[PDB]
Design a protein around this nucleic acid. Structure first.
Lengths: 174, 110, 127, 260
RNA sequence: CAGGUGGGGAGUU
């Protein structure tokens, strides 16, 4: 249980902005409830003020988890190792890619999203930009990095790959 | 000078019915001895309007814009009473979990 | 806010403006300008109807207890003709972020009792 | 039986998804409006996309009954003596609509990790995972919880442990709370010496705790006289379920209110 | 007043 350092916060802010853009301020500031980020071991957890008040009494070694984890802080200060923040990032995702049922199973299994399996796109998704994969029922699926843009994806072969999967909802039970 | 005439018209309208005009009168520079009497009359009219609409399920929702305006602007007692009425209405709405088709439960709560 | 929406509406292409527009409804409670702005926001491609529109429309429904019935009917018809399948905008809905000032977690019942007799008919038609 | 998470999806939507997936599910009686009992399911229930997304959680009807008996309120401090396996905590969080503070305590770290994973899957954000003794929790960790959920494990040593946990829960329950100092005690067995004797011992130990009706529409009343052992008149308010009576796993549910 | 937390801070090895 440690307060997040300025360097650590700045390292994760860019990663959050890679998927949510400037919408991170919405979660950062909330007058309704002081829900902020906290660092427990290597797992950053977004918890409320009351949760921090309750987790204050809990011991740092004893407190295994609290709130929702945004990903373990690796040696190179990398994030998204945990997909528990997918629900939070779904409401603030700048780019959303809807995948049909053909690629829905491979996405759950962790396979990259193929061009033939891409149903709907935001039409303004840049290459190597953090986007959010979604299903036909407007349900979050996982994390996927798209290496191609809509301008080139409008005319592409079915066998081509568009978005490479990095996290999925199936990892919760896998 | 014509504020007492407006208050009398508001009281007559409230009796016939049984907010924006009352808020404007309350927020007027005169209201916000004669000024105190007009403020008391406006508060009584606002309380009567709140009591008349208290039976409605959406009473806290309707009074929410007035509560925000009152908070931004006797006045403390009226605001506290309005907040208590909104809290009671919200609790009643939360308890009334029946679907919109079963409007009898809402009417019974009303 | 209307000018900002018009600028963003330019072909081939704002949260503070959106927040200002949402918060300005309460002081308002001009109708044609508001209807045009709502139509432009609805006309935006996939920028709305992601469960956020219902939260925005909840304040509009609450503020619809006043003003002419024709304006209120047009505001209701704006969401009635919307392609979104959400139906809880006229009742309890999801959390009300963006300043809030409302239920986070009714109006038509009170709208039926109104000076204009057509208000009750419009509420019944909406229900 | 699977309990649908209201914080994730509606019961009707979950039923439609199950019908589309080819799982025959029906409502579990009238007491529970969200519990769905699956009779036939070609696809695996635990491997369903809705289950993975957290729409439904496999929980027993008897286990879900203690959550209904507790009846947690929004913006309230509810502490659970046994957080494992997490189904009761998820039901309490769903009832609270992600409001208030939920104190989830699990003495076993192995079960605590599973409970934390289930909480993350369900999406509960106001739940705190802690590993401390239930008896020492009221005095050493935190007390004054508005609601107490004592899902005591369910022979002489177990009864003594259950009595100790009940006393700690009563002490941890705040009688001055606005929502009321309600403590719900649940057991996994229908043993008289485990449920009725513990309730009588707890009532004698704490005069400020008075037995109240659990509010369950089904369940056998608590026994007042069993052979030479006689229980207090208020013990009849306890709800008892049997496999041959309620068609569910045997459990005993009791509700106590703290005055001082 | 008592308790929890406490590489947050101060001090010992």
């Amino acid at each position: 249980m440690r307060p997040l350092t300025h360097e650590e916060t700045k390292t994760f802010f860019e990663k959050l902005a890679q998927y949510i853009g400037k919408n991170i301020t919405h979660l950062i500031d909330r007058p309704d409830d002081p829900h902020c980020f906290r660092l427990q071991k290597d797992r950053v957890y977004y918890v409320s003020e009351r949760a921090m008040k309750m987790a204050t009494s809990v011991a740092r070694q004893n407190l295994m988890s609290l709130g929702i984890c945004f990903g373990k802080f690796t040696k190179t200060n990398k994030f998204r190792l945990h997909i528990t923040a997918l629900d939070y990032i779904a409401q603030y995702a700048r780019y959303k890619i809807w995948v049909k049922s053909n690629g829905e199973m491979p996405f759950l299994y962790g396979n990259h999203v193929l061009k033939a399996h891409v149903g709907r796109i935001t039409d303004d998704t840049p290459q190597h930009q953090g986007v959010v994969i979604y299903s036909m029922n407007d349900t979050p699926l996982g994390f996927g990095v798209t290496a191609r843009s809509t301008l080139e994806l409008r005319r592409l072969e079915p066998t081509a790959i568009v978005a490479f999967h990095q996290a999925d909802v199936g990892e919760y039970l896998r | 000078q014509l504020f007492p005439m407006r208050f009398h018209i508001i009281r007559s309208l409230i009796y016939l019915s049984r907010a924006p005009s009352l808020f404007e009168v309350l927020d007027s520079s005169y209201v916000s001895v004669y000024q105190d009497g007009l403020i008391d009359q406006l508060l009584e009219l606002l309380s009567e309007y709140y009591v008349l609409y208290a039976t409605d399920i959406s009473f806290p929702e309707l009074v929410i814009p007035a509560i925000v305006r009152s908070k931004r602007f006797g006045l403390l007692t009226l605001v506290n009473r309005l907040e208590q009425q909104s809290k009671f209405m919200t609790e009643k709405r939360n308890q009334q979990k029946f679907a919109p088709i079963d409007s009898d439960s809402v009417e019974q709560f009303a | 806010v209307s000018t900002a929406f018009e600028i963003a509406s330019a072909q081939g292409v704002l949260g503070l403006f959106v927040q200002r527009l949402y918060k300005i409804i309460f002081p308002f409670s001009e109708m044609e300008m508001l209807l045009k702005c709502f139509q432009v926001f609805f006309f935006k491609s996939k920028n709305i109807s992601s469960s956020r529109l219902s939260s925005f429309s909840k304040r509009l429904a609450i503020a619809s207890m006043q003003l002419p019935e024709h304006s209120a009917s047009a505001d209701l018809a704006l969401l009635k003709k919307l392609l979104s399948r959400y139906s809880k905008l006229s009742r309890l809905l999801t959390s009300e972020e963006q300043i809030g000032d409302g239920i986070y977690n009714y109006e038509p019942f009170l709208l039926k009792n109104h000076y204009s007799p057509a208000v009750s008919q419009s509420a019944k038609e909406l229900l | 039986t699977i309990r649908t998470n209201t914080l994730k999806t509606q019961r009707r939507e979950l039923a439609q998804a199950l019908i589309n997936r080819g799982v025959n599910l029906e409502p579990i009686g009238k007491w529970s409006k969200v519990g769905l009992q699956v009779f036939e399911s070609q696809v695996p229930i635990g491997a369903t996309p809705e289950y993975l997304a957290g729409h439904y959680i496999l929980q027993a009807a008897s286990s879900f009954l203690p959550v209904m008996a507790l009846a947690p309120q929004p913006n309230e401090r509810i502490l659970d003596m046994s957080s494992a396996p997490g189904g009761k905590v998820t039901y309490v969080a769903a009832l609270q609509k992600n409001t208030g503070i939920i104190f989830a305590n699990d003495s076993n770290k192995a079960r605590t990790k599973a409970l934390s994973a289930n909480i993350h899957r369900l999406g509960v954000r106001n739940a705190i995972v802690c590993n401390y003794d239930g008896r020492k929790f009221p005095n050493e960790v935190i007390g004054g919880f508005d609601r107490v959920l004592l899902d005591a494990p369910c022979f002489d040593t177990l009864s003594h442990l259950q009595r100790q946990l009940l006393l700690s829960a009563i002490d941890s329950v705040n009688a001055d709370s606005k929502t009321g100092g309600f403590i719900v005690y649940s057991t996994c067995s229908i043993t008289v010496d485990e449920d009725e004797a513990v309730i009588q011992y707890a009532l004698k130990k704490r005069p400020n705790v008075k037995l109240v009706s659990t509010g369950l529409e089904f369940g056998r009343e608590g026994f007042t006289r069993f052979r030479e052992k006689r229980f207090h008149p208020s013990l009849k308010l306890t709800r008892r379920y049997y496999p041959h009576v309620h068609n569910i796993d045997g459990f005993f549910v009791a509700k106590l209110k703290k005055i001082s």
